[PDB]
Amino acid sequence: ASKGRKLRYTVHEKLQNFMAPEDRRSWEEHAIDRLFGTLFGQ
Amino acid sequence: KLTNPGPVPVYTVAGPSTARPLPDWLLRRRKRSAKYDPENLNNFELIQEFEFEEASNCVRVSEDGNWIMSTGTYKPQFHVHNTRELSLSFSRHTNSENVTFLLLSQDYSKSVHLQCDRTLEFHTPMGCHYSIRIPRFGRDLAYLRQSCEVLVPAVGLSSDGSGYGEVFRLDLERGQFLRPWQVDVGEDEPGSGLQGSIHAGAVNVAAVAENTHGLCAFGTSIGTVEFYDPRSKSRVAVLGNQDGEITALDYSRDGLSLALGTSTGQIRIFDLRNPRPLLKKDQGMGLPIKNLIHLTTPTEERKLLSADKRIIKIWDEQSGDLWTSVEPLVDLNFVTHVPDSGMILTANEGKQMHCFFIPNLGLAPRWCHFLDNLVHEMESEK
Amino acid sequence: LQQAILLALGLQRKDIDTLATELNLPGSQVLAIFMKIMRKVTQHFG
Amino acid sequence: DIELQKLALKAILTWKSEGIKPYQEHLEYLLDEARFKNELTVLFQGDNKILPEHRSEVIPVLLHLLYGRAISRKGAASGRHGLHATRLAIIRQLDVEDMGSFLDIGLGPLRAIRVVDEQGVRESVFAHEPLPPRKQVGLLNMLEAVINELGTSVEPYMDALVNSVLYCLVNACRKL
Amino acid sequence: GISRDSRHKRSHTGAKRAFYRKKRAFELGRQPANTRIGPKRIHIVRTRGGNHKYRALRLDSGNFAWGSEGCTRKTRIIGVVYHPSNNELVRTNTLTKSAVVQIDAAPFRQWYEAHYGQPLGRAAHGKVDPALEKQFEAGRLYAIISSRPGQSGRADGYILEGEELAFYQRKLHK
Amino acid sequence: RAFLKQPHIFLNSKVRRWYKDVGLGFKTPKTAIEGHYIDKKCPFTGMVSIRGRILTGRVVSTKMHRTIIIRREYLHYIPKYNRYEKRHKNLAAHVSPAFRVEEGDMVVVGQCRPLSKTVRFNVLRVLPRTGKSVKKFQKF
Amino acid sequence: MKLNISHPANGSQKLIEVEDERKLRHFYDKRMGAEVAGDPLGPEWKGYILRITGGNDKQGFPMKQGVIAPNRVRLLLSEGHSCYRPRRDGERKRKSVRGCIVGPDLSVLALSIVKQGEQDIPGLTDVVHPKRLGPKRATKIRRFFSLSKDDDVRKYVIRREVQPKGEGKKPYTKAPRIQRLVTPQRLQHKRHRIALKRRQQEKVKEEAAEYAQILAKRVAEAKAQK
RNA sequence: GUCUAAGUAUAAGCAAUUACAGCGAAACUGCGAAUGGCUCAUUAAAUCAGUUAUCGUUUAUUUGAUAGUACCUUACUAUGGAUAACCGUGGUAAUUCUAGAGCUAAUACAUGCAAAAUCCCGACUUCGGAAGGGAUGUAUUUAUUAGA
RNA sequence: AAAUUUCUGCCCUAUCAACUUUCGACGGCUGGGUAUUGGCCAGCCGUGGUGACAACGGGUAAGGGUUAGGGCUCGGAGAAGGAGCCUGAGAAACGGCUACUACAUCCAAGGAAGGGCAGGCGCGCAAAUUACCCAAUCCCGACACGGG
């Protein structure tokens, strides 16, 4: 209701096409999804 | 240009000589009315207007390394320099004292900053791309480059839904607030305002890597690090019960060993799967460490430790030995290094931003070649 | 890095260009570093 | 003289001592005429208060300079806000052992004075002057500031205080 | 871009309007002062009629009033305790107007034992309220800033006593 | 919150209540005199100054935080009809807790400085009448 | 790179053509204001040492002191700097400028001998050049001549003789109108100022006393009506 | 752009019978340029008009007044420095580009110690004029008291 | 001088009855800035506020005082384009600086400064001075003179 305190999920027109996603990542994703598997819990 | 220590000499080429300087108007008055004989040779500048007339908040050098963007306090603004040409490229102003910024592009063409008046403001060399007012107050910032999305910790509890605490997030190819990443801070007073309470209710630090995996590491004011994973949109880990508010959060060059630190001044180096600390150091006094990042001489690895008591200690990691320590004579709000080598830049509470050179760690950078000859001139002096 | 430079000319015996390439440096910076080397060996000698 | 005091302080720091070392910037900021009061409240009730270890090493130079700064007439204004509030705040923020050493340096000739003997009145003492009346009225202003900013704690110096003030009073009533 | 105008707002009828006029120099809004803890960092700015005001941003010592007995002294600042507006101001420890802040007790206790003489915080006219005496034995009282540090360059105010004292101490307990 | 206080009357003294008249033949009510409510926007309690315009009228809305609305009707002369045409207005004023507030009553209000976007005005006298809802109509 | 070397204690300056950058090699890597001996320059330069004060490179860009660069660097300059006179006041104009490091790329080098050697340079050390003006303030002249409190600086002035037009007339003397001279007129002006001061104050005293007796009379008449 | 008896003149500027004197290029200083008007999408009680109010505000310029503020442990004593213009050595291809070296002034920027001083009181009083009683500005901010 | 502010007065239209709360919409409390009052902005909560007496929306067709009369008087945005800054009593001058963009000038190729109205043509055939002075009135400045 108030000034900005509510997340008005409004599509922002100039804020729309700022930066293209740049996948700068060094590993092969299998290392890390096994890693997130056997983190502290496993 | 002086040197603080004996064995491993640091070299403050520039900075405030006096912790309590006079008013600059009276200073120039006494200058223009008084006869004085200063050391014209060894006292100099590298770069034009390396000050902010009250203090500064945050500095970064670009991925191209050619731009020095520094956010400063009085009539709040930001100085951007081309360090290739050793001068201000320009100096553009804002509406309140900035908290912290980040550069999107490899050059200065795209900047964003969290600003104290609940805002996230964007900047091109043309001018200002319009700011976004976040709902609740925040501390720090991180950027998902692989899928361009700014994320920001928030203090206090959420209004509806759960009572965890949140990390606001907005994608750059989408334009919307996607969803606040709910990170549990703890309990708060039910009879209060919507901004939370003073005693607790804060998520403080967030760290990520952008060459390795880059897990979303979060740090909150009960001394707790949490973890989220990109492409999962979900929490991964809750770990690290400590006493102080966790202020440091930084991945190493491998992407595995984490080096966090708590506001008691207690630094801990962890392995991502060993819950036991790889290393612990409780140093200085209780006045909180602010910034800790890894840094490498061309052979070895070492670590920064910046505590706001004018304490900047470079420690070793492989041995844990305190390699060096400097007293920058003033309170300081930000520390960087040159990723090339050599220089350690520090935005301060003082008038002039203060910077340092170390020869035993690295060389004079690619835009100041003769600084090696300057420290050689100091070597001829002593 | 002084020890590497001192190795690379004093016992590996090469030139400033291949030194610039090998340890990743633009120009006469290594020449200024050996000027420092000469300074320290002279302050030892005598 | 402020210039005399500044060259004096330069020779004081030419005496290289570890007691005077961590406060030398405070001494320079005291002698700098544009930061006197604020450098004083940097010295006291600041983070860098005086360490009691080398406090004995640091007291004489700072008390001497502080006396000279309370005496110097140039930068002072008119009225009470000229130099009276300065001496007021000085003795408000000084210590009682520091007050004893301060009165020690303040009383030049009357530090060792006797006004009462085994007899009643020391007329042989009273029929002489060591001082001009300018320094006498300055002495009385100093001790009035001492007594008013001290209160009760004036007991262990009384044997000098009453002798000094009563000599000045009896010289006054003789001159009237 | 910051100002004080009303052209961007709506009417009493709830209706908005363009009424677009360019922002002018008598409508000026100036950037705020976050007056925080540090050594003296005060700027001076000329204003309408060239009139200079003092924007303080870092301040160390303020003058505070024990005026129920008749003195005020320039003491150091410890840090903010509570701000009625914003917990974020309380977080970053900013000095604003009407801000309850802890301060030192040494020159006040010196004046007490210099005038009355009775030791305090360690006949009948010398009388300290017991909560104030708790502050005295703590050596760090609660005063309040009643000056505008951004618009006067200085932190002047009065010590907290009695009813407002218990009120704000209870609010600390809240 | 903070503590409500008369800004320059010394309370924490060991050894008053300031209330001023507005003049102009008005009487400070006893609730404004010694009633322990303190509000900076009341004329007798706070430091606001009434001057310039004096008005009256009928409340339509008592249900707001110390803010009523006066509906001001008048008979505007349309020349095309050669007639007097009823035109209601809507006014704004700050309500002191000093007066007893009724709905539909004739309330006397005087002008002070602007205290918000809307409020420039303060109650000085209330006349308790049996006025009905917005269906009623009278030139006033 | 040619060398303008000045002996400022002699008041003399001299540009000299200088070849042999081999002989100029020791000037390299030198900040301005730094001390370098002219002994490796030439045989007439034994014992000579000098500081470097400025210079202009090819395309004449001047060299600012205190800037760490060897190349030409684009700076921004405010009012009170050298190398730049401001087009208007309060003006910060951005301009390129050569850096402190004496590279190979210069055209001239500004130097000043701060200490001679035993040789004398036939055109630099040999010719004396006086200050064109002596001091004007009486305390300055008293300080130079070390005069006493009575010595009449008025006759201890320095005069200049000139020959005017009119087909070779008599010489004419010139004297610089000493500023800081107390004249009896100035003393009278001080007297006049303080006289107006005391006159103002006694007039306030008179009007206050007469207003006091007037108000006493008026309240006496008022309570007499009462 | 800007000069009057009333800012700073050693123009090695003119013109003459002793720090200075007249005329006076140059330079510093102070003032100026909140306008003269030009272009073009408009402004539908928001401007605008009457009508108030500032006990809610800033004001170079005008004239009117306008400042009691000593002493306050040195025991000793009508003050500073710059620099311009000026003289010279240059650079570059060079523009309001200017480097080095040497000068000098302020209404430019800067500091600033005689047993008196000045108030309020006055007992006694020959209008005598006074014993002797007390006291030492302004600007800023906060608190208190008075505001009869 | 500048700056807010009060009551009234807009033209037509319901193929415009819901609107505001969608940069708060209305309060009141607290802070920030402003020369000051002010949700003008920042924290706290309350509930609004307007409208069939015509809100809101649409349309563009953008008058007042001097009274026999007519006359006579007064009457938004930009300085190649966005963004930031600088003097002054007063400018957010369009006077300047800085960046970005876009032209575009000289060059010895390394560099360097800069962006106006008026006029004539506008088919190959056509039509009103390229006048002069500040003499008066008025305006600005160290100022009787200088400039408009």
UniProtKB/Swiss-Prot annotation, chain B:
It comes from the Eukaryota. It is found in: Nucleus, Nucleolus. The keyword Repeat applies. One of its GO terms (cellular component) is 90S preribosome. Belongs to the WD repeat NOL10/ENP2 family. Component of the 90S pre-ribosomes. May be involved in rRNA-processing and ribosome biosynthesis. This is Ribosome biogenesis protein ENP2. The lineage of its organism: Eukaryota, Fungi, Dikarya, Ascomycota, Pezizomycotina. The gene is ENP2. The chain holds residues 2 to 383 of 668 of the full protein.
